[PDB]
């Protein structure tokens, strides 16, 4: 399939170059494969998830992302237009409050509930969980992700937009998990992004349009925004039967496109992510 004038995120993932703007991908796209948006939330009813949208937990007093950043992410992930696996189910952990904060102890129970929450949903091709947050570093936090990640989802989480080692934060730093830099149009580190040895992918991060509360749209910026990408094309790739969630950060990186982004420091891998579509 080839949708046209697509955000430049979409286009990238499917395009050995920059600058082209249709996103090409198998039809699939990844109907039968779950994404877990831990984040703020998601506007389910936003026409742009078309009913595959739900809140399945929440932390706070409601579970309406009053913020936008979960809708926004879940947009990527998974919308109809701003979407990389358009036919994925999302479910919604409201792991952030309104203002965009969490106690990592909430965080760690957000992710401990997926683990265990995949259980009671219908995710013949695979459950991913995007983790577009980031604190400074924490073990427990980190564990909290290893477990997710060792309970069989794949964990696609944010670097971190303090353009530092992702080291320091977390759950960035945790090894196991796939660890996603931030890209530009113009196939630059986003210069927010976090780098380091760490880090497993990259993807579009700057100016990443995707829907947002209120049934609307918006632009903006963040590892945070890259991180859907990733777990979305992970749901894609896993719908296609190319990988599992225990190898699909490997599979991603082992087939993104190699040595095409500019400023990324030495020591940091080069690997933009890549669906290797063919139409």
């Known amino acids: 399939a080839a949708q046209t004038n697509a955000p430049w995120g979409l286009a990238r993932i499917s395009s050995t170059s920059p600058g082209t703007s249709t996103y090409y991908y198998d039809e699939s796209a990844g109907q039968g494969s779950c994404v877990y948006v831990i984040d703020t939330g998601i506007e389910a009813s936003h026409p742009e998830f078309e009913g595959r949208a739900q809140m399945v937990k929440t932390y706070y007093y409601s579970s309406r992302d009053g913020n936008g950043h979960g809708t926004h992410c879940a947009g990527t992930v998974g919308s109809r237009t701003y979407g990389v696996a358009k036919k994925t189910q999302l479910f919604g952990v409201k792991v952030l409050d309104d203002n965009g904060s969490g106690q990592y102890s909430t965080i760690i129970a957000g992710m401990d509930f997926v683990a265990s929450d995949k259980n009671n949903r219908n995710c013949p091709k695979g459950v991913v969980a995007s983790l577009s947050l980031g604190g400074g570093y924490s073990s427990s936090v980190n564990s909290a992700a ?37 890209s530009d149009r113009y196939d630059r580190r986003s210069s927010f992004s976090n780098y380091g040895s760490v880090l497993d992918i990259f993807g579009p ?42 190898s699909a950060c490997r599979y991603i990186a082992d087939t993104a496109n190699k040595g095409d982004l500019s400023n990324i420091p030495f020591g940091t891998v080069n690997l933009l992510a890549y669906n290797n579509y063919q139409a």
């Open 146 to 182: 290893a477990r997710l990640q060792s309970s069989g989802v794949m964990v696609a989480v944010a670097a971190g937009n303090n353009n530092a080692d992702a080291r320091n934060y977390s759950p960035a730093s945790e090894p196991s998990v796939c660890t996603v830099g931030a």
């Open 205 to 246: 991060g700057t100016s990443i349009l995707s829907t947002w509360i209120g049934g609307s749209t918006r632009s903006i910026s963040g590892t945070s925004m890259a991180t859907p990408h990733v777990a979305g094309l992970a749901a894609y790739l896993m719908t296609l039967g190319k990988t599992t969630a225990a």
